[PDB]
Write a protein that binds this ligand. Structure first.
Ligand SMILES: Cc1cc2ccccc2nc1-c1ccc2c(c1)CC[C@H](C)N2C(=O)c1ccc(O)cc1O
Ligand SMILES: CC(C)c1ccc(COc2ccc(CC(=O)NCCN)cc2Cl)cc1
Ligand SMILES: [Cl-]
Ligand SMILES: [Cl-]
Ligand SMILES: [Cl-]
Ligand SMILES: [Cl-]
Length: 336
């Protein structure tokens, strides 16, 4: 086989970050999407695969890692087939879309698969701070890499099968996504607890006092994050007030500035002490025999962040920081 040679070849290129703008303007440009995707997916696959291989033989040789490594090898090769094919042959295009689908389905379970490797490492070698910083370093990178691959793939398969441009909404109403995510979390909250905090939403459009706040974003990434946040805020609120009557609302604010769009979600669930806040974001210290960390990645992915600060004995605030302008929303990608 050729795999390690290909990996070596394509790992000399640097993956290429795109912006929301460049992502929009892509969506008949199917020849052009293809000729781009056939270089770039291998680049991105090569690069992360190269980094998997820098892991110590004690990690590298465990079943989890070796399995997901087998998926990446097949996906690379799967796309190799197409390096010398013909962009003008409308059935070459037709069967590449099929090929991307099969790849997206080969990888659906990397999250819980890798989670197994964390779990085995944890009982196999220990949960020390140094192990943990490396797991953290590796997984933020790997999962961020993966997020971008799916972004590429979803943009192609959705556009090449009028308002939304595949997974991007160029007029995303942020309150709307807030309410939806809330409704859904509230549904689960009512099932498992038979009580649930209300929602208040206020907007602050700096430049434009009374216009509803819209942006260019990938709404499902935003739903993902809001949803996680609402689950956490509901849990704490409900459970901190079991012996008590009153049940405080979850208060969200959506602020729109010159460069940030920010979303705060304040609760009164009684908080977390400063010392325990880092762990909530740790893959290792929160795996036990998508999550905060992964929500944060989604924010980081287009130059955003997702930050927690608590007041122990009162509650927790959670901010999602996003770039307001499409021009500032550019993929954050790791490189070998
Ligand atoms: C993040 C998380 C995942 C869980 C998964 C399974 C079971 C319980 C869980 N609980 C949490 C969870 C949620 C809120 C909080 C904590 C843990 C630690 C204790 C504390 C009361 N707490 C918070 O203050 C808190 C944390 C994140 C957040 O977005 C909102 C919050 O109100
Ligand atoms: C499941 C996957 C995500 C996983 C599980 C576990 C790990 C852990 O990897 C470690 C653990 C400890 C050290 C310190 C050290 O002293 N190293 C010696 C040099 N080799 C380095 C690394 Cl890369 C990574 C990835
Ligand atoms: Cl993911
Ligand atoms: Cl729940
Ligand atoms: Cl933080
Ligand atoms: Cl290095």
């Amino acid at each position: 086989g050729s795999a390690p040679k290909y990996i070596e070849h394509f790992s000399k290129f640097s993956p290429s970050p795109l912006s929301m703008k460049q992502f929009l303007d892509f969506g008949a440009c199917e020849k052009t999407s293809f000729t781009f995707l056939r270089q770039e997916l291998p680049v991105r696959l090569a690069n992360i695969m190269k980094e998997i291989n820098l892991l110590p033989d004690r990690v590298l040789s465990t079943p989890s890692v070796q399995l997901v490594q087998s998926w990446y090898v097949q996906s690379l090769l799967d796309i190799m087939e197409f390096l010398d094919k013909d962009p003008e042959d409308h059935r070459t295009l037709s069967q590449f879309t099929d090929a991307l689908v099969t790849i997206r389905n080969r990888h659906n379970d990397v999250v819980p698969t890798m989670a197994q490797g964390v779990l085995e490492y944890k009982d196999t070698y220990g949960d020390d701070p140094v192990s943990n910083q490396n797991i953290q370093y590796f997984l933020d990178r790997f999962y961020l890499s993966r997020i971008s691959i799916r972004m590429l793939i979803n943009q192609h398969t959705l556009i090449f099968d009028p308002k939304h441009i595949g997974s991007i909404d160029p007029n995303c109403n942020v309150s709307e996504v807030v309410k939806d995510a809330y409704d859904m979390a509230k549904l689960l909250c009512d099932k498992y607890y038979m009580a649930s905090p209300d929602l208040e939403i206020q907007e602050i459009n700096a430049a434009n006092s009374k216009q509803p706040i819209h942006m260019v974003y990938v709404p499902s990434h935003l739903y993902h994050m809001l949803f996680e946040l609402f689950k956490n805020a509901m849990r704490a609120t409900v459970e901190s007030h079991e012996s008590s009557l009153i049940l405080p609302p979850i208060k969200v604010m959506v602020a729109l500035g010159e460069e940030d769009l920010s979303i705060k979600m304040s609760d009164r669930g009684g908080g977390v002490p400063l010392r325990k806040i880092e762990r909530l974001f740790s893959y290792m210290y929160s795996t036990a025999p998508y999550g905060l960390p992964i929500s944060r990645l989604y924010a980081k992915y287009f130059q955003g962040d997702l930050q927690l600060f608590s007041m122990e004995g009162f509650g927790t605030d959670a901010v999602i920081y996003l770039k307001a302008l499409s021009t500032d929303s550019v993929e954050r990608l790791p490189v070998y």
